[model samples]
Target: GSKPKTIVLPPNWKTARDPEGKIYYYHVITRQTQWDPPTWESPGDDAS
Candidate 1:
């Protein structure tokens, strides 16, 4: 089986879905939006 990559939501960053349910990322401080995640990790609590 396969699994989706885990996206690490960095500080001041958030995730949201558009009207069509498309996942997107947004910046809290700058109020910017992007199609790709800011940071990503394989899986685990190793975000330190």
Candidate 2:
């Protein structure tokens, strides 16, 4: 539910991940965050 060790958490204005999950943050293009702060992301889309 957060970031990985030694791996700088990817900023998600569009998306993000923990590097070990089957999926991650999925924000709407209009509802995405602009910084590495708290997530404004939604759900559904992800990276394997």
Candidate 3:
């Protein structure tokens, strides 16, 4: 792998909740779901 450019948001990932109000992440492109947030390439890059 030639370092495929990690990013906080890669266009298809989104945060959503289930019918019972459980939060989860889903890929709009692939239709896969997960309980963890997407990998942030530059973690803590934000400032208040």
Candidate 4:
């Protein structure tokens, strides 16, 4: 048996990084719709 899934991810997912800083972004695109842009987590090199 298989369970039904409600959420679906776009076939084309991409991630890009900035050359100047430690930041990134992502995008999800589909045939009829596109999702809101998402930013990557900030660099956490500073640890206490």
Candidate 5:
């Protein structure tokens, strides 16, 4: 007996598809907060 196989692609797979066809495109705005370099502290911090 054998089990079924499943295929999973990465989150960016759609970007690799053909862009000439009638494809639906959407933009996802992601906000990431991180400390700046050198000080690695928030912008409010004087070290930043």
Candidate 6:
């Protein structure tokens, strides 16, 4: 969808649009990743 969003990326965290009204997450150092996000939800929800 490419809707604009603003988020404070956490330490070692990264993001990418998942194209389903969602954004995904990744780890900068661990090289680990997640490729799913719930529509209208915040990845920050799970980041904590």
* Highest-scoring model, TM-score: 1
> In each prediction, how many residue pairs overlap at the backbone (N, C-alpha, C within less than 3 A)?
0, 0, 0, 0, 0, 0
Whichever of 1 and 2 has more lDDT, that candidate is: 1
RMSD (Cα, Å) for all candidates, in order, is: 7.1, 10.5, 9.5, 13.0, 17.5, 7.3
Alpha carbon lDDT of each predicted model: 0.48, 0.37, 0.45, 0.32, 0.26, 0.51
Give lDDT tens digits, candidate 3, residues 1-48. 232233335544545344976655556667776545443332222210
| Superposition TM-score, candidate 3 onto the true structure | 0.33
Cα lDDT tens digits, model 5, 1-37, are 2322221233321112245543222222333323233
Residue 18's lDDT in candidate 2: 55
TM-score of each: 0.38, 0.19, 0.33, 0.22, 0.17, 0.32
Model 6 clash pairs are none
Which 10 consecutive positions of candidate 5 have the poorest summed lDDT?
Answer: 7-16
Number of clashing residue pairs, candidate 4 = 0
Model 5: colliding residue pairs: none
lDDT of candidate 1 over 1-48, digit per residue (tens): 233354546643555445976666556668676555433333222232
Ranking by TM-score: 1, 3, 6, 4, 2, 5
| lDDT ranking of the models | 6, 1, 3, 2, 4, 5
Off by over 4 Å in 6: 1-12, 34-48
Off-target runs (Cα >4 Å) in candidate 1 are: 1-12, 37-48
Candidate number with greatest lDDT: 6
